[PDB]
Design a protein around this ligand. Structure first.
Ligand code: NI
Length: 341
């Protein structure tokens, strides 16, 4: 059954609530983003209205086969009326097509649902600038001070420089990047760009990337593996076993692999700066774990909430243990005391 922190008081709306069968009283189901934890339950057999971004809508149609008549895309940054209620979709800085949803309730209440997000100072100049939020439904994935990691830009710099140096030293090296879901596309795109290559991949992954509205995409990606020196593979193949296997299929083209495994936060960020990171090596294979996060750091999340000044906060992640719940409530009170709201 659908939990409380996925319902929208005083509307017939839910958010990311597709795995609980028919929800009692729901006339419209919002989807924040095309990630399996959130879309879980949607298929060709779904027959209620689904409201989402255009990008999320292209994925629902082509990958999940949801019938066109039930897909309702909305533009960003635009006041829209749905079933008699004003709503706005805002860029969540998460994966392609991900949004936060602002709801203007009939009773004068204003609710912001962040879905999954990476808070950014640029959000302080969105349609949120105007106005008050009574309830904030917050992605608390990394709500503890120990969670630190670099900017996306620093991680991409590191990856571009590492791949360019290795390929310039050895024109016979192949670059491999691991993937599982959408998001983090900049890692393989930026590497392929610096090397003058298209990204090679499976037919299923090419199909997925074609739904994303990336300008110039036909020029950047291909299913012809033999013409590309940057290959995408499923994340679970990014190990010495998997990579050796892959290298045998390439027909004596390459004598080295350098591979990249994008992760979220790991404990090594406590101690090692991005510039100082080093790979795991076995023979002519090397594997770099890189901390490319699409969720807020603690510092990022704190800045956004202290700016927003919401009246109440309801966490949507780490809500399963008393200790987690308690710890989050303690941070929300410090932030409020420090900033004066
Ligand atoms: Ni997500």
């Amino acid at each position: 059954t659908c939990p409380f922190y996925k319902k929208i008081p005083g509307t017939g709306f839910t958010v990311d609530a597709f795995q609980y069968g028919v929800v009692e009283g729901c006339t419209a189901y919002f989807l924040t983003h095309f990630h399996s934890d959130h879309y879980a339950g949607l298929s060709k057999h779904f027959t209620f209205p689904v409201y989402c971004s255009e990008i999320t809508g292209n994925l629902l149609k082509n990958k999940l086969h949801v019938q066109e008549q039930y897909i309702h895309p909305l533009p960003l940054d635009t006041e829209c009326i749905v079933n008699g209620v004003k709503v706005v979709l805002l860029d969540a800085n998460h994966c392609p097509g991900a949004v936060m949803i602002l709801f203007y309730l009939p009773n004068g209440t204003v609710i912001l649902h962040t879905g999954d997000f990476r808070a950014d100072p640029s959000m302080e100049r969105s349609l949120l600038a105007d106005q008050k939020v009574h309830m904030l439904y917050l992605d608390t994935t990394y709500c503890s001070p120990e969670y630190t990691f670099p900017s996306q830009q620093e991680v991409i710099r590191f990856a571009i420089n590492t791949a360019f140096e290795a390929v310039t030293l050895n024109p016979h090296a192949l670059v491999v990047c691991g993937t599982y879901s959408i998001g983090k596309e900049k890692v393989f795109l930026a590497i392929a760009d610096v090397l003058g290559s298209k990204v090679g991949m499976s037919q299923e992954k090419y199909k997925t990337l074609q739904c994303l509205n990336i300008p110039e995409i036909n020029s950047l990606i291909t299913t012809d593996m033999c013409s590309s020196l940057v290959h995408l593979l499923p994340m679970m193949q990014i190990n010495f076993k998997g990579l050796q296997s892959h290298l045998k299929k390439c027909g004596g083209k390459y004598n080295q692999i350098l591979a990249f495994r994008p992760t979220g936060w790991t404990h090594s960020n406590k101690f090692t700066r991005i510039a100082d990171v080093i790979p795991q090596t076995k023979g002519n294979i090397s594997i770099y774990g890189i901390p490319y996060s699409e969720h807020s750091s603690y510092l990022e999340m704190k800045r956004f909430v202290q700016w927003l000044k919401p009246q109440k906060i309801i966490p949507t992640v780490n809500v399963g243990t008393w200790k987690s719940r308690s710890t989050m409530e303690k941070y929300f009170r410090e932030w409020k005391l420090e900033a004066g709201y």
